[PDB]
Amino acid sequence: LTSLPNRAFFEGRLSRALRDANEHREQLAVLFIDSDRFKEINDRLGHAAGDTVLVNIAMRIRGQLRESDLVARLGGDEFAVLLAPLASGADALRIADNIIASMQAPIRLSDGSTVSTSLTIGIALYPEHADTPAALLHDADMAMYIAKRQARGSRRLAELN
């Protein structure tokens, strides 16, 4: 266990954060992070190593967020981050850049072995992209798929797909 809040919890914070944002004129963002080439790592190193990587990734994500932001594991190799309140989309991209830059440093395994991985991020914005939690999540999900598709270790802002 990574000790990070789960999906259910994340969806809750989102609903309320979305309200707060709408009530008072503010912006919020949902970022989706997918560890690059996770499967290959498992096959070659095993699931035990995969976990150690997830844990490390969890810390590297949290260590780059404001105490106001939220980090939760959607499951397996994917994480979901809440950026609220946001002053603009530029900030959301700024934080994503930082998250991807923190992964540039190799991950030291329990037996001295090193593992270098990348983070693919899909950024969905409110209220530009979506007006509700579901859609905002779906948008961050799809934008995170295309990124994996176009390039990995990259961030991608949703647009009509």
Numbering used by the authors: 254 to 414
Quote the authors verbatim.
YfiN, also called TpbB, is a multi-domain membrane enzyme connecting periplasmic stimuli to cytosolic c-di-GMP production by an allosteric inside-out signaling mechanism that, due to the lack of structural data, is still largely hypothetical. YfiN is an inner membrane protein composed of three domains: a periplasmic PAS domain, two transmembrane helices and a cytosolic portion of the protein, which includes an HAMP domain and a cyclase domain (named GGDEF from the conserved residues in the active site). Formation of SCVs depends on enhanced c-di-GMP output by YfiN, which elevates transcription of the pel operon. The negative regulator YfiR is a dimeric periplasmic protein which controls the activity of YfiN by binding to the PAS domain of the DGC.
In order to gain structural insights on the allosteric regulation of YfiN, we expressed the cytosolic portion of the protein, including the HAMP and the GGDEF cyclase domain (YfiNHAMP-GGDEF; residues 183-435). The solved structure confirmed that YfiNHAMP-GGDEF had actually undergone proteolysis and that only the GGDEF domain had crystallized (YfiNGGDEF). The crystal structure of the catalytic domain of YfiN is composed by a five-stranded β-sheet core (β2-3-1-6-7) flanked by five α-helices (αA to F). YfiNGGDEF also displays an additional peripheral β-hairpin (β4-5), which is present in all the homologues structures (PleD from Caulobacter crescentus; WspR from P. aeruginosa; XCC4471 from Xanthomonas campestris and A1U3W3 from Marinobacter aquaeolei) with the exception of WspR that displays a long loop in a very different conformation. However, the cyclase domain of YfiN significantly differs from the other homologues at the level of the allosteric inhibitory site (I-site). The GGDEF domain of YfiN displays a conserved RxxD motif in the Ip , while the Is appears degenerated. In particular, the second arginine necessary to form an inactive GGDEF/GGDEF dimer, is substituted with Asp-273. Finally, the α-helix harboring the Is (α-A) is shifted with respect to the corresponding helix of PleD, WspR and A1U3W3, which all display product feedback inhibition. The shift is due to the hindrance of Tyr-379 side chain.
